[PDB]
């Protein structure tokens, strides 16, 4: 079927620029309008631009006028997007979405998305520190353990316990900025029967930084 | 630009019961409104088209309408799964639009939150830093409110909250709060001390170590 995969999401200096990717198949590609449009982390979705199925007809966004440049490469079925300039505000998960559903235009297939950050923080990935109930918690049946994710950059951050052993009773936190650098944390309940004879772990990954942190959780 | 509002931004509601949700333009729409749904993982996908149609795999539970410049998205019954970002669009006319969105979520029963307060580890503190974390879990409805008290003393500086998304299983909700501290000033207070306030209770939910 229809298939829409984009690519050449990632960090960069405002000012700055990049250029996105996104590999169509299963259909006729030459035949197709596309679009750019992109969703901020807070938030919504926000049209970028269009491109007619021979690159003849290009509409832009009022926000990206003259800095965002749409094209194509028809014989490699891949759509773009050429981004200069890039402001802050341009930070947001960027999808292309087919102009298909004739007659009745609609955008109704749409790639995964890919992540762009516009800021001159740098890639650091986090500490990572285990949390580690009381000074050890006696009671309850039920015991709740956590895992500190901190002064990363930029997101995301993917938050496993034993590996993927543990998923239910798991929190983990959307991420908030503090001092130009990213934070979470993630809980965990486990059997206080079981812990901590049976060993429990948060794993911390940071794709940016192809960095990969485990830390058991220890009682005190 | 065809401006579109659409409102509620977040909006509950009870597993059997209708959900209404509302776009207005700014200016007249000639049953170009679409509709998309978005799941938490996932892209917006394709929904309604033409006002009133349901597109490929759409449930009947689904349904637009409108005309010039009021439409609307109904879900009757709302069902477990129906738990989405909701966005209507215009293509009418260049440039093309979306309204600012809706959160559906579930209403359930009212939950107190379960707290749980950690100390900085010994491993954050050997590097200067001392984060203080509370965990309010598993708690409805989302509104809550948290303040941090060190020996006593409100102290909003250095407060980081975050909400996660309504849970899949419980239809519940648990925030993440942090005090941001250094050791330095860490060591020379005596008692941490998140407090919360919730409509599940008259008194505020309180919960307190001595650092040791």
């Known amino acids: 079927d229809v298939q829409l995969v984009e690519s050449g999401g990632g960090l960069v200096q405002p000012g700055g620029s990049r250029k996105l990717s996104c590999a169509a198949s299963?259909?006729?590609?030459?035949?197709?309008?596309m679009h750019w449009v992109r969703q901020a982390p807070e938030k919504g979705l926000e049209w970028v631009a269009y491109?007619?199925?021979?690159?003849?007809?290009?509409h832009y966004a009022d926000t990206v006028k003259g800095r965002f440049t749409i094209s194509r490469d028809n014989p490699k079925n891949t759509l773009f997007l050429q981004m200069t300039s890039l402001r802050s505000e341009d930070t947001a998960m960027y999808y292309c979405a087919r102009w298909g559903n004739y007659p009745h235009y609609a955008m109704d297939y749409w790639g995964q998305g890919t992540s762009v950050t516009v800021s001159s923080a740098k890639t650091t990935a986090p500490s990572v520190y285990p949390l580690a109930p009381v000074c050890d918690g006696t009671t309850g049946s039920s015991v709740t353990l956590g895992c500190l994710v901190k002064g990363y950059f930029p997101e995301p951050v993917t938050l496993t316990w034993n590996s993927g052993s543990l998923s239910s009773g798991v929190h983990t936190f959307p991420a908030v900025l503090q001092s130009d650098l990213y934070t979470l944390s993630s809980s965990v309940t486990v059997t206080s029967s079981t812990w901590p004879s049976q060993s429990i772990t948060c794993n911390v990954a940071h794709p940016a930084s192809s960095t990969k942190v485990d830390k058991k959780i220890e009682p005190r | 630009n065809i401006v579109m509002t659409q409102s509620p931004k977040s909006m509950s509601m009870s597993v059997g019961e209708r959900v209404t949700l509302t776009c207005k333009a700014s200016e007249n729409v000639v049953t170009y409104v679409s509709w998309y749904q978005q799941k938490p993982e996932q892209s917006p996908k394709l929904l309604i088209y033409?006002?009133?149609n349901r597109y490929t795999g759409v449930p009947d539970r689904f349904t637009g309408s409108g005309s010039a410049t009021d439409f609307t998205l109904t879900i009757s019954s709302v069902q477990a799964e129906d738990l989405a970002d909701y966005h209507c669009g215009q293509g009418y006319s260049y440039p093309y639009t979306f309204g600012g969105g809706t959160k559906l979520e579930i209403k359930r029963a009212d939950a107190a939150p379960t707290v749980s307060i950690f100390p900085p580890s010994s491993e954050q503190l050997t590097s200067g830093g001392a984060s203080v974390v509370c965990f309010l879990n598993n708690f409805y409805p989302k509104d809550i409110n948290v303040k941090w008290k060190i020996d006593g003393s409100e102290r909003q500086n250095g407060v980081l909250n975050s909400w996660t998304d309504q849970d899949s299983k419980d239809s519940t909700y648990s925030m993440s709060s942090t005090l941001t501290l250094t050791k330095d000033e860490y060591e020379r207070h005596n008692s941490y001390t998140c407090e919360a306030t919730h409509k599940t209770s008259t008194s505020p939910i309180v919960k307190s170590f001595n650092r040791n």
């Open positions: 033409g006002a009133s």
């Open positions: 299963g259909f006729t590609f030459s035949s197709f309008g």
């Open positions: 491109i007619s199925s021979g690159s003849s007809t290009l």
